[PDB]
Design a protein around this motif. Sequence first.
Motif, mmCIF file in Angstrom:
data_model
loop_
_atom_site.group_PDB
_atom_site.id
_atom_site.type_symbol
_atom_site.label_atom_id
_atom_site.label_comp_id
_atom_site.label_asym_id
_atom_site.label_seq_id
_atom_site.Cartn_x
_atom_site.Cartn_y
_atom_site.Cartn_z
ATOM 1 N N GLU A 42 -14.195 1.342 -23.642
ATOM 2 C CA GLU A 42 -14.250 1.303 -25.106
ATOM 3 C C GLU A 42 -14.107 -0.114 -25.664
ATOM 4 O OE1 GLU A 42 -11.556 4.018 -27.041
ATOM 5 O OE2 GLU A 42 -12.261 5.752 -25.892
ATOM 6 N N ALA A 43 -13.417 -0.979 -24.921
ATOM 7 C CA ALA A 43 -13.168 -2.355 -25.351
ATOM 8 C C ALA A 43 -14.344 -3.296 -25.080
ATOM 9 C CB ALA A 43 -11.897 -2.889 -24.709
ATOM 10 N N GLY A 44 -15.331 -2.814 -24.328
ATOM 11 C CA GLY A 44 -16.560 -3.567 -24.093
ATOM 12 C C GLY A 44 -16.736 -4.170 -22.711
ATOM 13 N N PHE A 45 -15.796 -3.909 -21.804
ATOM 14 C CA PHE A 45 -15.891 -4.437 -20.439
ATOM 15 C C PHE A 45 -16.940 -3.707 -19.609
ATOM 16 C CE2 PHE A 45 -11.655 -5.753 -21.810
ATOM 17 C CZ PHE A 45 -11.641 -7.091 -21.434
ATOM 18 N N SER A 46 -17.590 -4.448 -18.716
ATOM 19 C CA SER A 46 -18.637 -3.900 -17.860
ATOM 20 C C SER A 46 -18.088 -3.381 -16.534
ATOM 21 C CB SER A 46 -19.725 -4.948 -17.606
ATOM 22 O OG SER A 46 -20.673 -4.488 -16.651
ATOM 23 N N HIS A 47 -16.993 -3.973 -16.061
ATOM 24 C CA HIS A 47 -16.427 -3.591 -14.768
ATOM 25 C C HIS A 47 -14.911 -3.732 -14.670
ATOM 26 C CE1 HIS A 47 -16.287 -7.897 -13.497
ATOM 27 N NE2 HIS A 47 -15.389 -7.454 -12.636
ATOM 28 N N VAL A 48 -14.348 -3.133 -13.623
ATOM 29 C CA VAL A 48 -12.950 -3.338 -13.257
ATOM 30 C C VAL A 48 -12.851 -3.878 -11.833
ATOM 31 C CG1 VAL A 48 -11.943 -1.637 -14.846
ATOM 32 C CG2 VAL A 48 -12.700 -0.888 -12.566
ATOM 33 N N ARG A 49 -11.913 -4.796 -11.620
ATOM 34 C CA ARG A 49 -11.572 -5.254 -10.277
ATOM 35 C C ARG A 49 -10.262 -4.589 -9.884
ATOM 36 N NH1 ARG A 49 -8.852 -10.198 -8.122
ATOM 37 N NH2 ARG A 49 -9.600 -10.564 -5.986
ATOM 38 N N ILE A 50 -10.264 -3.940 -8.722
ATOM 39 C CA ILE A 50 -9.106 -3.197 -8.239
ATOM 40 C C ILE A 50 -8.555 -3.872 -6.988
ATOM 41 C CG2 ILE A 50 -8.208 -0.896 -7.597
ATOM 42 C CD1 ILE A 50 -9.583 -0.921 -10.383
ATOM 43 N N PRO A 51 -7.493 -4.686 -7.146
ATOM 44 C CA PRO A 51 -6.808 -5.240 -5.983
ATOM 45 C C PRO A 51 -6.205 -4.109 -5.159
ATOM 46 C CG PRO A 51 -6.216 -6.453 -7.949
ATOM 47 C CD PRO A 51 -6.960 -5.239 -8.405
ATOM 48 N N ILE A 52 -6.506 -4.089 -3.864
ATOM 49 C CA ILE A 52 -6.005 -3.032 -2.988
ATOM 50 C C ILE A 52 -5.380 -3.585 -1.712
ATOM 51 C CG2 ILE A 52 -6.521 -0.887 -1.731
ATOM 52 C CD1 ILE A 52 -8.996 -0.597 -3.682
ATOM 53 N N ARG A 53 -4.161 -3.130 -1.446
ATOM 54 C CA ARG A 53 -3.425 -3.487 -0.248
ATOM 55 C C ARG A 53 -3.583 -2.399 0.806
ATOM 56 N NH1 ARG A 53 1.966 -6.836 -1.330
ATOM 57 N NH2 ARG A 53 2.902 -6.797 0.772
ATOM 58 N N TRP A 54 -4.586 -2.539 1.667
ATOM 59 C CA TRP A 54 -4.837 -1.537 2.704
ATOM 60 C C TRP A 54 -3.842 -1.617 3.852
ATOM 61 C CZ3 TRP A 54 -8.423 2.166 1.782
ATOM 62 C CH2 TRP A 54 -9.376 1.896 0.783
ATOM 63 N N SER A 55 -3.339 -2.824 4.100
ATOM 64 C CA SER A 55 -2.540 -3.117 5.291
ATOM 65 C C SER A 55 -1.243 -2.320 5.397
ATOM 66 C CB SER A 55 -2.245 -4.617 5.382
ATOM 67 O OG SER A 55 -1.660 -5.103 4.171
ATOM 68 N N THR A 56 -0.716 -1.873 4.262
ATOM 69 C CA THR A 56 0.511 -1.077 4.260
ATOM 70 C C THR A 56 0.227 0.429 4.238
ATOM 71 O OG1 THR A 56 0.700 -1.454 1.864
ATOM 72 C CG2 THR A 56 2.031 -2.857 3.311
ATOM 73 N N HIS A 57 -1.038 0.794 4.447
ATOM 74 C CA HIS A 57 -1.458 2.195 4.450
ATOM 75 C C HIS A 57 -2.404 2.501 5.611
ATOM 76 C CE1 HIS A 57 -0.532 1.274 0.113
ATOM 77 N NE2 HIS A 57 0.292 2.277 0.356
ATOM 78 N N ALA A 58 -2.239 1.762 6.703
ATOM 79 C CA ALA A 58 -3.025 1.970 7.909
ATOM 80 C C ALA A 58 -2.145 1.774 9.132
ATOM 81 C CB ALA A 58 -4.204 1.015 7.944
ATOM 82 N N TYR A 59 -2.487 2.458 10.221
ATOM 83 C CA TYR A 59 -1.738 2.321 11.466
ATOM 84 C C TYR A 59 -1.800 0.902 12.032
ATOM 85 C CZ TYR A 59 -0.944 7.320 11.257
ATOM 86 O OH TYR A 59 -0.539 8.575 10.865
ATOM 87 N N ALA A 60 -0.713 0.494 12.685
ATOM 88 C CA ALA A 60 -0.539 -0.881 13.146
ATOM 89 C C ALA A 60 -1.350 -1.205 14.397
ATOM 90 C CB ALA A 60 0.939 -1.173 13.383
ATOM 91 N N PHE A 61 -1.634 -0.182 15.198
ATOM 92 C CA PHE A 61 -2.304 -0.372 16.480
ATOM 93 C C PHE A 61 -3.651 0.342 16.505
ATOM 94 C CE2 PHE A 61 2.324 -0.467 17.230
ATOM 95 C CZ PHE A 61 2.454 -1.771 17.696
ATOM 96 N N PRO A 62 -4.578 -0.109 17.378
ATOM 97 C CA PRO A 62 -5.890 0.534 17.458
ATOM 98 C C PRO A 62 -5.726 2.048 17.593
ATOM 99 C CG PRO A 62 -5.810 -1.361 18.911
ATOM 100 C CD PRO A 62 -4.416 -1.156 18.408
ATOM 101 N N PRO A 63 -6.563 2.842 16.896
ATOM 102 C CA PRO A 63 -7.752 2.495 16.112
ATOM 103 C C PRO A 63 -7.503 2.078 14.654
ATOM 104 C CG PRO A 63 -7.537 4.866 16.193
ATOM 105 C CD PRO A 63 -6.315 4.296 16.878
ATOM 106 N N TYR A 64 -6.256 1.747 14.313
ATOM 107 C CA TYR A 64 -5.906 1.214 12.987
ATOM 108 C C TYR A 64 -6.363 2.105 11.832
ATOM 109 C CZ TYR A 64 -5.921 -3.118 15.839
ATOM 110 O OH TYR A 64 -5.724 -4.064 16.818
ATOM 111 N N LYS A 65 -6.107 3.404 11.938
ATOM 112 C CA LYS A 65 -6.631 4.363 10.968
ATOM 113 C C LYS A 65 -5.963 4.241 9.601
ATOM 114 C CE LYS A 65 -7.439 9.310 10.230
ATOM 115 N NZ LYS A 65 -6.983 9.397 8.809
ATOM 116 N N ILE A 66 -6.783 4.142 8.556
ATOM 117 C CA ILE A 66 -6.291 4.187 7.180
ATOM 118 C C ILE A 66 -5.847 5.617 6.866
ATOM 119 C CG2 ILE A 66 -6.938 3.977 4.727
ATOM 120 C CD1 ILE A 66 -8.982 1.729 5.831
ATOM 121 N N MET A 67 -4.686 5.747 6.224
ATOM 122 C CA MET A 67 -4.122 7.056 5.888
ATOM 123 C C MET A 67 -5.049 7.823 4.959
ATOM 124 S SD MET A 67 -1.165 7.133 7.495
ATOM 125 C CE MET A 67 0.502 6.451 7.739
#
Length: 309
Positions: A42-67
């Motif tokens: 509504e304010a006139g913006f075309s996009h949003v940037r979403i900073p995302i921290r994946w590293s604290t939501h994935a397993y530490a060892f292979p296969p490093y699965k994201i939750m």
Amino acid sequence: VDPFERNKILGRGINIGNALEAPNEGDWGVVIKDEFFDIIKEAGFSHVRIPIRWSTHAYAFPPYKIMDRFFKRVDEVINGALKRGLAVVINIHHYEELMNDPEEHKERFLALWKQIADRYKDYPETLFFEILNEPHGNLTPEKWNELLEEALKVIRSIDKKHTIIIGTAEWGGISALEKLSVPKWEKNSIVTIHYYNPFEFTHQGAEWVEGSEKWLGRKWGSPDDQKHLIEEFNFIEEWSKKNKRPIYIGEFGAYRKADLESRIKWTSFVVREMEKRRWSWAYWEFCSGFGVYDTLRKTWNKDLLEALI
């Protein structure tokens, strides 16, 4: 695909920070409400940037699965924005061990990008993949050149639809731009720079910045000021033309402690200079420390919104 046309589509935007890039969403004060997307559109913006921290939501060892729970949350944020006709930039942001220990964490980082590209490969063309926020520290310019190419290969083996956004090392500013190398074989990328100059102005009194009070009462607007900012932008535009890469100022903003007159002058001047050059951009940020929207009072900072839009 034309990355310059994609950069136009990206256009003007805003960061929703202190949210998903915290250790957990809400740790740094912001939970992304679906309502935000109506407010931002509504304010006139075309996009949003979403900073995302994946590293604290994935397993530490292979296969490093994201939750799965975290992937579903991210889906929800992306689709919420897309639904308003907003473009979306997602990234990997605050992977702290990667910056300090790139040799060990390269493998995990690339496994994260494999999963992300795979999940969103069929999402609309208005979704952008930003490799890594502000590479710095032990992740040097040379090592970043090495990492980003490997990231490109991993992503491109999966997804040749989406535009990729590539930052600079040494904290993502202008200093390391001349060092940045994007492989010639990649033809759908936008280069991102974060612009906070003059730093002493924009971060005067910034609590998390050592000796920043020395800069309080610092103003901006003089003829010298304009010349310099124009000169620094000429450097960026030159590089852009020589290398034929579109430019995205993914972050810019001035801290609340700067006098409001100068804040307005700086913000409106940066905006007009960027738009002179057909650069896409994203203000830092929507609703926290550098925030221009008050979620309690449900009101924009009118002076600053005018400077932005």
